[PDB]
Each structure stands twice: as C-alpha cells, then as structure tokens.
Amino acid sequence: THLFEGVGVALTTPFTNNKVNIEALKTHVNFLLENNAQAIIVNGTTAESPTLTTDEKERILKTVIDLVDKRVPVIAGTGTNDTEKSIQASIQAKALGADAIMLITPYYNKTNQRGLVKHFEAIADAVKLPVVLYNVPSRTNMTIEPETVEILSQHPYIVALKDATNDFEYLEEVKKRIDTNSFALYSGNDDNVVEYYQRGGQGVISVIANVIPKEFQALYDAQQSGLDIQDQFKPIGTLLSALSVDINPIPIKALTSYLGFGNYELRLPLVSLEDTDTKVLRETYDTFKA
Template sequence: MTLFTGTAVAITTPFKDGAVDYGTFERHVDFLINNGMQSIFVNGTTGEGSTLNEDEKLKLVECAVKISDGRVPIIVGTGTNNTALSIEHSLKVKEAGADAIMLITPYYNKTNQRGLIAHFTAIADAVELPVVLYNVPSRTNLTIEPGTVKTLAENDYIVALKDATGDMRYLEQVKSLVPEGFAIYSGNDDSIIPFYERGGDGVISVVANAVPAEFQTIYEAYATNPEEAQRLFDKVRPLIDALAVDVNPMPIKALVTELGFADGEVRLPLVPLEEADSKVIHEAYKAYRGESS
C-alpha cells in the first residue's frame, strides 16, 4: 500500500511556558491539511519527540487525528533504540488512532543489519500497522543497507522508507530492489528535484511547516513540467538554505513562531536561535514572499 504521494510535513510541536500548546498545534495541523499536505508526521525529530513524555505524545496524536478527521494519514514516530519500548508505545498510538508509524534505526546501542531486520520485524508484526522505515545516518550513525530494505519490504506491514541520506545512488539501489508499491520518500528538502527524477514518491518536509502549498505544488508540477518545478524550487531554495543556519528543528521553530504556530520555545537540550540567525531566516522568508526589508 502507498500511504501518500507528494508532500508530507514533519510537524513542529509548540510549547508555551514549558507545556505543549495543543490548541496551537491543532490550528497548525488544520492549516497544513488545508494547504495541500498529503500526510502529517507527528512526534518526529522536527516535533522534538525525544523530549516529549508519553502522555504528551499520545495527546498530540489524538489532536492530529481529531483535526485531520480522515482527510490525510497521521503517521507517528515511535521508534527508539529499545525494541520492547517501541512496541509498547506503538500499540498505544495505534489505539489513539494513528494510521501508520515511523521507525528510526536504533542509535547509541546501534546494531548490525541482521539486528535491524529483527528489530523492525518484531515491531511491525506486533503492532500490525503500516511502517515507514527512517534511515538517517547523520543522526544515528547507522544505515539501513539497500539489501536490508529489500528484505524488510517483504513484510506486509513495512511499506515505505524515509531516506534522509541525500545520496541519489542509495535511492537508485533501493528503488531497484523493492517491490512496486513500496514508497520511498525524501527526508531532505534541498534535494527533492533529483529525488523525483529518480522515481521518489514524495518528501517528508521540514520547510513545508511554513510553505505547505508551495512545496506540494513543486511535486505536482514535476509530473507534467519539470522545468517549472525546478523554477519553483529555485525560488524556495534560499529559504531552505536559511533553515540550515543551525540544528533542526531550532530554525523552523523560529519561522513557525513568526507565522503564529509556535511561541518561540524549544526544549533542552535545544535552545532558541541567536538573534542574528533568526534574522537570517526572517529575511529569507520575507524575500521568498516578495516583501521588502
């Protein structure tokens, strides 16, 4: 099964006075769906999932499910470096109404490729929800090798891969090995055009928190007019580059605060951006919108 094609968003989590601001989160979910997002990813890296407690995570899922009301799939990051804990939490988000789960590779106590197969298979078989594998070696120092993806894709529940390597050769290798219908999504906003050129099924985006309709339009344009898609991408590229001024999700949190979907807060060990870095993002966003300084 294909969960979605096109642009999904790894949604930010707003905080106010240290607590999750569920009302603002719900407004953001509705804004994103109304502006073309094909799926909402909750409690991921961009959502600061590693600093949320279990009650907060589950309530965010419930809020997203309620606001979506079946319009788009709600996919939830539940992977950890503890297989049993990942199963336990995944079953809870399933009960909360999640449509699918995303599983990151184990980190710190990283395993080998046989261990990855055992880990992901155990979770998928126990939870019985569609699974998106998340390959992000820059954060975990562990890669899901193409042959491992091929093996895992034989599991009925493992239906997609989020590829945050930025390596087009890796995409081509995986694409050549997995069955038709197994989706591969980019985890890098800055390389979506070459990703689409090689048959990628979409992107799980950070910048789409702020420009959802525009990023989805690039995907739609590519199908019929690649040159127009490239032109649209070139326009948004400076904003994507500006969001690399510091560690994700600190920069996107600053931008969505400007748009009214956060209150500037992040949770330690993250810290708010330096004022100069916030100005870089602010100016890039104004330039994208065609506003004068």
C-alpha cells in the same frame, strides 16, 4: 495504495512557556490541511520527540488524529533505540487511531543489519499497521543497507522508507531491490527533492512544509505533471539555505512561531537561534513570500 504521494509534513511541536499548546497545534494542522499537505508525520525528529514526555506525545497524537478526521494519513513517530518500548509506543499509536507508524533505525546503541531486521520485524508483527522506515545516518551513524531494505520491504506491513541519506547511489541501489508499486520512497531531505523526484521518489517528509506547505506540494505536483522544477525550486532552495544555519528543528521553529504556532521555544538540549539569526531567517522567509 501508498500511504500518500507528495509532501508529508514533519510537524513541529508548538510550545508556550514550555507547555504543549493544543490550540496552536490545531491551528497549525488546519493550516497544513488547508494548504494541501498530503500527510502529517507526528512526533518525529522535527517535533523534538526525544524531549517530549509520553503523555505529551499521546495528547499531541490524539489531537492530530481527531482533528484530521481521516482527511489525510496521520503517521505517528513511535520508534526508538529500544525495541520493547517502540512496540509499546506503536501499539498505543494504533489504539489512538494512527494510520501508520514511523520507525527510525536504532541510534547510540546502534545494531548490526541482522539486528536491524529483527528490531523492525518485531515491531511490525506486534503492531500490524503500515510502517514507514526512517534512515538518517547523519543522526544515527548507521544505515539500513539496500539489501536490508529489500528484506524489510517484503514485510506485508512495512510499506515505505523515509530516506534521509542524501545519497543517490544508495537511492538507485534501493530502487532495483524493491517494487515501488507497493513500497514508497520518501526523501527525508528538503533540498534534494528536485533530483529525488526526477529519480522516481514518491514524495518527501518535509521540514520546510511546516511553513510553506502549498508551495512545496505545488512543486511536487508540477514535477508529476511533466514540468521541469529545477529552476522553480531555487527560491525555495534560497530559503532552505537560510534554514541550514543550525540543526533542525532549531531554525524551523523560528518560522513556525513567526506564523503564530506557539512561542519560539526549544526544549533542552536544543536552544533557539540567537536574535540576529532569528531575524535573518524570518526576513528570508518574508522575502520568499513577497
């Protein structure tokens, strides 16, 4: 009934001399599927969607869809801070074959809670496809209030929340206003997953699972089977700490490129880490693997 449970990956965009590299894109997705990724979130923040052209987003999304071939859900990031364009982009994602769309709250312009509902509901009504809300106040400086999540969760087509508030008071206020049989809560912050899972989350939409999908999903599966993951998490948390050297996806792409998925490139206004930080992060990764 939920789109997925466990680890979905906020897929990075592989660039090669500033161009989307479709062959690397396919290799990365294959690597994700072979390593137990439960879902692919395409053109999210981690994909640098703000600097992707529309053509790029569509070429990437169609590629992911045709390659995945329904083996896991393909969730297209289509929401912006403009309702009309979010509607257009969601409709194209539907037509290309996406299984769901992800919609962030507005940002920069922002809105009030009543506007927020109008915005999400307008997109959901127009697309008629499963929608994953995305709340990340550290990027948007607004939130989807718990009462607002309740109103929205009653939309037939709004099925989940990517919750990147890192606020467990908020998590508990949301829990008591939704039915998790029909409305899934996904962490949007890799390092809160131990507690996020303990408190009954349905999984995570993950940045680090770009490079360690198997281990990160295995951690979910252990929790779900009735095992304690508090200590088992630590070696991943060690890598997560090194990943926090800069704003995502600046650090994760040092690691995706290291594994062969595109060059280590970010599109402006983002920039790659400097050499020292890049080698430190890559070493940390090799130590995790060892």
